Structures are given as C-alpha cells and as structure tokens.
Write a protein that binds this ligand. Sequence first.
Ligand SMILES: CNS(=O)(=O)c1c(F)c(F)c(SCCN)c(F)c1F
Ligand code: NA
Ligand SMILES: [Zn+2]
Length: 258
Amino acid sequence: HHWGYGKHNGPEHWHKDFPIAKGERQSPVDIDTHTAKYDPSLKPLSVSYDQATSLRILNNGHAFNVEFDDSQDKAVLKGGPLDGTYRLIQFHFHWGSLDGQGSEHTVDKKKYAAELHLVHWNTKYGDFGKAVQQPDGLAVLGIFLKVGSAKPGLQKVVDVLDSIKTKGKSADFTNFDPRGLLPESLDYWTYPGSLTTPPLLECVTWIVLKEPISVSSEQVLKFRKLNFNGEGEPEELMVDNWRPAQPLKNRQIKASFK
Ligand SMILES: CNS(=O)(=O)c1c(F)c(F)c(SCCN)c(F)c1F
Ligand code: NA
Ligand SMILES: [Zn+2]
C-alpha cells in the first residue's frame, strides 16, 4: 500500500508516511499574482542546455521521467534567484484527466492542463542524493502547458510513450534537446518549497515561468494513455498525477518582472 494518486493513497494520505507533508515550506502553491513582490534584485535566469545529454525514459508508476547524464558540467541552471550552479538531472510532467486540470502550481487559482518540472541539483553537494538533504539542494524550473497549437519539441517524447505504457517499463532515450520545451520568455516567480511527491523534502528553490507552452490536444491525450499499473495488472490510466496547492504559510513569492 504505497503512496499514489487515488482515494486511499493520494495526497490527503501522504502525511502518515511523510509527516513533512504538513510542513512550513510545502509545494505546490497558488501564485497570487497581485501579492507576488517584484524584486529588482532578482537576475535573469540562465538556462544552458546546449550540451544536455539524455539517457533514457522510465514509467515509474507516478509519471514518466526523462533522465540525463549529469556526470559532467553540461546542462546548467544559474542566475535568477540562485547562488552557484545547478545541474539538470531529469524532467517529468504532471497532468490531468481533462484539459481544465493537471498543473501543480496555480496562478490566481487557474489550473493548467499540465506542468513540466526540470529538476536540477546544486553542484556544491556533489550529487543529487546529497543535494536533496539540503535546504538549497534543488532548483526546479516549472513550466505550464496549455492546450492549443502543438509543441514540435515535445513530439519525440510523445512518440516513445507507447513503449513505456506501464509501471516499470523503460527505454533508451538519447539526444533529446530540452530547449524545445521552453517558452519564449524566461520571466518567472520564485519561492522556497519542496518536492511535490514523497518524500516531500523541503529542498527546492522553485522557479515557475510565467508564460506557458502550448501543446496540442493530441499530445496531451497521449500522456493520458500511460498506465499507473504494471503490465498484467487491471489498467488504471495515468491521469491526475498532481498534488493540489498547499498552504503558503510564512512565505513570500517574488516576481522577476513588472
Ligand atoms: C517536483 N516534482 S516531483 O514529482 O516532486 C520530483 C520528481 F518526480 C522527480 F523525479 C525528481 S528527480 C528524481 C531522480 N533524480 C524530483 F526532484 C522531483 F522533485
Ligand atoms: Na545563459
Ligand atoms: Zn514534479
């Protein structure tokens, strides 16, 4: 009876195994755009993904994860609110059963169809496993997805999903360029938070881009053909794999713009 995204094991139950679920800096949150403080001291975000090297793709029963070779100083996030340099390790998405829900963060209560998380670890802690034990260990770049015109840079992902339909399946997935997942503008909101899945560690500086990417109805319909279950178990479609907004508590969300 492990954690998941149903009635008996979903977000409202996670606190029993992971009591930090009711902590002071949990994610995601609603971003109240009026309340967010413009911070002129914030820097432009530096995203340097030209040398990113992807390794594979896995359905872990919770999402699909595209994992990168992070053993050299390649694909790095820096600037913005960050001190030092954070190296890309993986990305994944959260999405809904319908286009009107799926994102983790919300913007003035608006839910997007999905949300992409690019996960990076602070190089000062040597690898991801040590970084998650630190308050400034991770930087996650979050990008909203709305449904409209296709995202041509997503299609290579979408077309491999058929090979990783069920929990535990993986594939080789090389030469995927995550620059094709970025919107035009790097304007962002930032605040201190957590992983959005167990173990819910409070290790993340969140950087959430204001401009969403557009993906097509057909692209998100293929996300919703994945399964939570393993091969040969009753089919439960992988949909609604998002945590709802959590209390903001002490925190201030800062804006890089306006
Ligand atoms: C914020 N979204 S999340 O679901 O909590 C999440 C993941 F799914 C991840 F896969 C990772 S990286 C896991 C391999 N290094 C992560 F840091 C992470 F934060
Ligand atoms: Na840069
Ligand atoms: Zn995530």
